UniProtKB/Swiss-Prot annotation:
The modification Phosphoserine is found at S73. H1 histones are progressively phosphorylated during the cell cycle, becoming maximally phosphorylated during late G2 phase and M phase, and being dephosphorylated sharply thereafter. Citrullination at Arg-23 (H1R54ci) by PADI4 takes place within the DNA-binding site of H1 and results in its displacement from chromatin and global chromatin decondensation, thereby promoting pluripotency and stem cell maintenance. The modification Citrulline is found at R23. The chain holds residues 33 to 110 of 221 of the full protein. This is Histone H1.3. It is found in: Nucleus; Chromosome. Belongs to the histone H1/H5 family.
Length: 78
DNA sequence: GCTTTTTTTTTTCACAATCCCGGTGCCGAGGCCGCTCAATTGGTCGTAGACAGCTCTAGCACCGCTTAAACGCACGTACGGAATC
């Protein structure tokens, strides 16, 4: 009955947190802190989270509404 | 071995759709009536085909050559289908 709680951590989650936010939103900075809130402070995972972007359009998971140079305002169904 | 972490999975909860009930009423299944016309009865008359008795067609069995076709193997090319995009 204590503090730590958070995510399931991959493309099951990049699709779940982007959908677990009630509405649309920007960048690596929104998605990672929702994914690292439990206590696992970000170390080497920084390249691993970063990679997910081409992996999502190539495998067809999130369309990006906004964003250019490692920024991406990712969408699901409206 | 042991973390660091995919995927896989399971769990959970919310939503939508379909499933099952009783209530209601409307109408066509069902059955009855009376009359009709088509099935039955009891009659005759002729021929369709059953049957015996015959013929002799063609279906079956057999036999021995001469191939042409079938069989098996060696080899490798291009096709099927699996994986990714
Ligand atoms: Ca008769």
């Amino acid at each position: 009955k204590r503090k730590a709680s958070g995510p399931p951590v991959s493309e099951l989650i990049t699709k779940a947190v982007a959908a677990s936010k009630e509405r649309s939103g920007v960048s690596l900075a929104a998605l990672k802190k929702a994914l690292a809130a439990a206590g696992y402070d970000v170390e080497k995972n920084n390249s691993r989270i970063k990679l997910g972007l081409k992996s999502l359009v190539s495998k067809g998971t999130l369309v990006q509404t906004k964003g250019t140079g490692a920024s991406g305002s990712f969408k699901l169904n409206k």
